[PDB]
Chains A and B, each alone.
Chain A
C-alpha cells in the first residue's frame, strides 16, 4: 500500500499569501497518477489537479501541481477567502488507491484569549433528574485550548464532552464548549463547580466557577 504523508497537516496563512502543500509517498507513484482535492465543511470534495500537474477546466489557475515519483506539491499562488479549506492528495498509480490525511489551510490572525463563561444546570433540567454544567470558551485564536473541570477542587474525568466550531468566517476565531453531566443526586453532593482554561493567549490559567444554589 502506498502511504501518502501530508505534512504539516495544518497551515495558518494570511489572505493573499502563497501556499505550498506537500504530499510525500512511501514509494514511487506510477505514471504520476497523483490528484489533489479541496473540501470545505458541509460540502463534497472537488477535483483541482490530476496526473500531478493537469488542471480541469473550471478550476482556478491559481492552483498548480508539480512533482514526480514520491515528492508532489500543490501551490496556491495567492490565497482567496474561499481557498481556506482542507486539501487532500490521492494516488491512483496502483489498483489500491489511497489518500493523504489532508492539510487544513486556515486563516492566520492575531492571538485572542478566550472569553470564558460557565452555566449552571437549568431548573427545568434538574426537575428531570440530571444536571449538565456548561463551560464556553468564546472567540479565541489559535485553535489549541484546554479545559478541565474541578468539582470541590477535584479534577473530573470521563463525565464531560467537548466540541469546537469551525473557524468563524467573519473574525477567524474559534469557540469551544464543554458539558459536564451528573445525576441530580450527585450534582447535589457538591458545592463548587469550576472550569479551568489554558490557551496561548493566557499568561496563566483562567478559572470560572459557581457555588451550587446561589
Chain B
C-alpha cells in the first residue's frame, strides 16, 4: 500500500525559508505525480505545486511561483517542499499528496501524508500559566485558562481523563504578543461542588509544562 510520511512540525521566523519532506513507500515513486497542498486558517485547501520525479518536471501555482521549489530524490523516494520569504499568512498545515491509481494514474489525490504544521512567528518557546475559572454564583460551569504559551499545541484533560462528559476545550487564540491562550471548561452538578474534586491536567510538551490545577469555588 502507498504510505506518505512527512517531517515534523516547524517554527520559522518571518523572512526565512522552510523545507518539508515527504517519504513514500509502496507503489512507484518515479512515475506518479506528487503535490503539496496547504491548509491555512480561512483558506480551506490550496494546491501549491507538484513534481513528476522521472521527468524532473514541476508545475507551480501562480500564487507561489517565485517562492517555491519542489524536488524529488528517487534514491530515497522522498519529495521536498521549500517555501521562501515566509510571512504570518504562511502559517498552515502543509500536506504532500500523491495521485491515485486504478496501475493507471487518476490525477486526483488518493494518498495523503499526515501533514506538517509550519508556524511562522517571532515568538520564543514559552510555557503557559494555568489559571482557574472558579465555579461561582442546578448546573455549574468551571474551567481552566491556559494562558501565554508558544508554540502549539497544548493538550488538556480533566481528572486524568476520567471526566469527559460536558468537557469543551476551545481552539487556541493567538494574542497580540504572538503567544497563544486557550480555555477548557466543563459543566457539573452544583451539588457536586462541595464533595467532588475537579483538576485540569495541562501538557505543553515544548516547554515541558505539565501542570495539574485543582479548580475550587472561591
A interface residues with partner B (beta carbon < 8 Å) = 1, 33, 35, 37, 39, 44-47, 50-51, 54, 56, 88, 90, 92, 95-102, 115, 117, 119, 121-122, 124-125, 128, 132, 134, 136, 138-139, 161-165, 168, 170, 175-177, 179, 181
Contact = CB atoms under 8 A, between A and B. Distances in A.
B170 A134 contact: no
Contact of B61 (A96, A121, A122, A124): A96
Given A50-B106, A51-B108, A179 B173 contact: yes
B133 interface: yes
Contacts, number: 127
B143 A162 contact: no
Given A99-B44, A175-B168, A124 B173 contact: no
Nearest to A95: B59
Contact of A163 (B35, B95, B106, B170): B170
B107 A47 contact: no
Of the candidates B47, B131, B137, B183, the one having the most CB atoms from chain A within 10 angstroms of its own CB is B131
Chain B interface main SS type: strand
Nearest to A134: B133
A96 B63 CA distance: 10
A56 B110 contact: yes
28 contacts: A33-B107, A33-B108, A35-B107, A35-B108, A35-B109, A37-B109, A46-B112, A50-B108, A51-B108, A92-B108, A96-B61, A96-B62, A98-B47, A102-B45, A119-B143, A132-B181, A136-B133, A136-B183, A138-B168, A138-B185, A161-B173, A163-B170, A164-B170, A164-B171, A165-B171, A177-B170, A177-B185, A179-B181
Chain A interface main SS type: strand
A99 B44 CA distance: 8
B132 A122 contact: yes
A44 B47 contact: no
Contacts of A92: 107-108
A148 to B, nearest CB: 17
B113 interface: yes
B200 interface: no
Contacts of A33: 107-108
Interface in B164-194: 165, 168-173, 175, 181-183, 185, 187
B141 interface: yes
| 7 tightest Cβ-Cβ pairs between the two chains A and B | A50-B108, A35-B108, A44-B112, A161-B173, A119-B133, A117-B141, A163-B171
Contacts of B106: 50-51, 54
A138 B183 CA distance: 13
Given A50-B106, A134-B145, A136-B185, A122 B173 contact: no
Contacts of A47: 100, 108-110
B216 to A, nearest CB: 11
Contacts of B115: 44
B183 A88 contact: no
Contact of B141 (A37, A46, A136): A136
Given A46-B112, A132-B181, A176-B170, 19 more contacts: A1-B62, A37-B109, A44-B115, A45-B109, A45-B112, A50-B100, A56-B110, A88-B45, A92-B108, A99-B46, A99-B47, A101-B44, A122-B132, A122-B134, A122-B145, A138-B168, A139-B187, A165-B169, A175-B185
B139 A119 contact: no
A125 B143 CA distance: 14
Nearest to A139: B187
Contacts of A1: 62
